[PDB]
Design a binder for this molecule. Structure first.
Ligand SMILES: [Cl-]
Lengths: 242, 75
């Protein structure tokens, strides 16, 4: 029974909560709503500004999560070393506001359609931005996304300076298509890649996958079965303690 | 009394409710405005999920309080 169903915002959130218990530097950012390709940079800048405020002992400007107490959120901003920025994408809408309307319409229908889950990891400790597209070039060619992210890295060096002067670097994770053998396995792939990264931030696991699509998909099914078992009894709509 | 319900787009819905209203009755009032079936809705106030079988007053919700509506988003 090797099924990989299309993972929704709720199971992705529960996996994040679980991954925080294992790696406390990960902050389980909410996915209701997740970021988009049109506001992920703004969302990350807002989070980093709040972390700077908590380190100075000042008030936060928000926005606050809805399933976390304000004081627990302040404790997670003090702790965190890694931002797991899930992004929901659809090829039809071309602005932020049009993408939010498309997201509501598909949420209410219960349809996957042409929608896709992407991941940007902000590694604060390594100063690394990592972009993972299981479909390789679903949004745009990778050399175009690297250029956009290189300009954003320069902005982050001003927003969130280190003690020393180290500049943010950019990694495009997928060197060719990852997700073969299914149209609906993107959210599962994102969580599997994030777990490999947490185990090893230099991971080369994407370059060591089975060649035939039916075996590669079976292995991801095993991960999905283990993750669903691990989160099943963890608290619904409730952040863990920092 | 009036209360507000925030959705994923950031748009706010206004409802007319009494404190003795059940959470299932609130979810029906949201269906009347937005066309979302109650079984697809979860509601949050003060960091906690509001449970079917309880009332608004069981959570000390007051005039002009804001609730959050959560949906499941596939991809
Ligand atoms: Cl954290």
């Amino acid at each position: 029974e090797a099924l990989v169903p299309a993972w929704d915002s709720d199971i992705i959130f529960k996996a994040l909560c679980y991954f925080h218990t294992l790696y406390p530097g990960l902050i389980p950012l909410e996915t209701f709503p997740p970021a988009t390709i049109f506001n992920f940079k703004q969302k990350i800048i807002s989070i980093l500004e709040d972390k700077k405020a908590v380190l100075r002992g000042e008030p936060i400007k928000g926005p606050l999560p809805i399933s976390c107490s304000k004081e627990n959120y302040r404790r997670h901003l003090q702790r965190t070393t890694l931002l797991p920025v899930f992004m929901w994408y659809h090829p039809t809408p071309k602005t932020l506001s049009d993408t939010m309307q498309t997201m509501k319409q598909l949420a209410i229908k219960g349809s996957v359609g042409a929608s896709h889950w992407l991941l940007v990891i902000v590694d604060i400790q390594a100063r690394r931005l990592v972009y993972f597209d299981s479909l390789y070039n679903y949004v745009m060619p990778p050399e175009n996304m690297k250029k956009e992210l290189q300009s954003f890295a320069q902005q982050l060096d001003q927003v969130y300076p280190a003690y020393d002067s180290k500049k943010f670097s950019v990694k495009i994770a997928a060197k060719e298509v990852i997700q073969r053998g299914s149209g609906s396995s993107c959210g599962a792939w994102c969580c599997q890649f994030l777990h490999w990264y947490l185990k090893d931030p230099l991971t080369d696991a994407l370059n060591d996958l089975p060649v035939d699509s039916v075996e590669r998909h079976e292995n991801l099914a095993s991960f999905v079965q283990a993750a669903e078992a691990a989160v099943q009894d963890l608290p619904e709509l409730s952040w863990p303690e920092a | 009394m009036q209360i507000f319900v925030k959705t994923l787009t950031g748009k706010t819905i206004t409802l007319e409710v009494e404190p003795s209203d059940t959470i299932e009755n609130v979810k029906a009032k949201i269906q009347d405005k937005e066309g979302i079936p109650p079984d697809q809705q979860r509601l949050i106030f003060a960091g906690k999920q509001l449970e079917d079988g309880r009332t608004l007053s069981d959570y000390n919700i007051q005039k002009e309080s804001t609730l959050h509506l959560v949906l499941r988003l596939r991809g």
